[PDB]
Amino acid sequence: TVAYIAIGSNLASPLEQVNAALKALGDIPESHILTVSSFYRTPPLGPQDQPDYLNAAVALETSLAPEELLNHTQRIELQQGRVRKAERWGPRTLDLDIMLFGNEVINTERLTVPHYDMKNRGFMLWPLFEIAPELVFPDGEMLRQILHTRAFDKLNKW
């Protein structure tokens, strides 16, 4: 089933951080990357004050619910992106959540197809909108069109 794991990451060189997830997410026990692109920048506004970041949408065919999925992804983020002790400070680390899960309906905590906070998260829906602008169904609305009327309209490609 095609799932969506929008990876975040930031700090000076987010290239390494992002790659952390790309590693596990790359060859997960039963998952496999399918569509991943749309690299851009996002302003901290809250967690930090250092503008940079490097977000990119990902959609791989995972056989294990985001529960296990995220475990592996953040697993690397828990022993790769610095994390010599929980990334120490604000910047760095990874933050990839699941947006959809086969377009079906399944909400819990680690998994939520309808996906919350999406509307106010143009830096997660817009990217995947490039690799697949037909999801919508999950909640009845696409990804960018929700942020287009709620969040932004189209962020810059880094």
UniProtKB/Swiss-Prot annotation:
GO biological process terms held by the UniProt record: folic acid biosynthetic process; tetrahydrofolate biosynthetic process
Protein's gene: folK
Assigned EC number: 2.7.6.3
Catalytic activity: 6-hydroxymethyl-7,8-dihydropterin + ATP = (7,8-dihydropterin-6-yl)methyl diphosphate + AMP + H(+)
Temperature dependence: Thermostable. Retains 75% of its activity after heating 30 minutes at 96 degrees Celsius.
Subunit and interaction comment: Monomer.
Function per UniProt: Catalyzes the transfer of pyrophosphate from adenosine triphosphate (ATP) to 6-hydroxymethyl-7,8-dihydropterin, an enzymatic step in folate biosynthesis pathway.
Entry protein name: 2-amino-4-hydroxy-6-hydroxymethyldihydropteridine pyrophosphokinase
GO molecular function list: 2-amino-4-hydroxy-6-hydroxymethyldihydropteridine diphosphokinase activity; ATP binding; kinase activity; magnesium ion binding
Family from the record: Belongs to the HPPK family.
Keyword terms, alphabetized: ATP-binding, Folate biosynthesis, Kinase, Nucleotide-binding, Transferase
Pathway(s) where this gene product acts: Cofactor biosynthesis; tetrahydrofolate biosynthesis; 2-amino-4-hydroxy-6-hydroxymethyl-7,8-dihydropteridine diphosphate from 7,8-dihydroneopterin triphosphate: step 4/4
